[model samples]
Target: ASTSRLDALPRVTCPNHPDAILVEDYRAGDMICPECGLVVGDRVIDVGSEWRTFSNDK
Candidate 1:
């Protein structure tokens, strides 16, 4: 198949405030909406690798 395997998910937004900018707080693990100062998401897990070297051919 020539299609993307990524699922089409709905955009995460504050219910009271739509189309507002969201801030990602890695240290606190929170996704916040500045418009309403709402915590949209919390305790988000970061799956990204922490190491620098992968030793792969670029």
Candidate 2:
């Protein structure tokens, strides 16, 4: 069972932005500032489901 909650995770603001937006990449092991994509962590692991993007142009 996981004890850490997403919303309860620690938050840090980027220098480029006035307000800090906690990185949702907690599961990725990378603390990135969402506003400016500032990476503050080593990004050791990326434990997430496979992600794919599709084009909808016809």
Error of 1 at 6 (Å): 13
Put down candidate 2 lDDT per residue, 1-58, tens digits, no spaces: 3775476334446657767664755355667776777766664555678555585568
Clashing pairs in 1: none
TM-score versus the correct structure, for each prediction: 0.40, 0.37
Per candidate, the number of residue pairs that clash is 0, 1
RMSD of 1: 5.5
What is the per-residue lDDT of model 1 for residues 1-41, given as tens digits with 9 covering 90 to 100? 55877664434566677777667775775677879886755
lDDT of 1: 0.67
Pairs that clash in candidate 2: 13-20
lDDT accuracy of residue 9 in candidate 2:
37
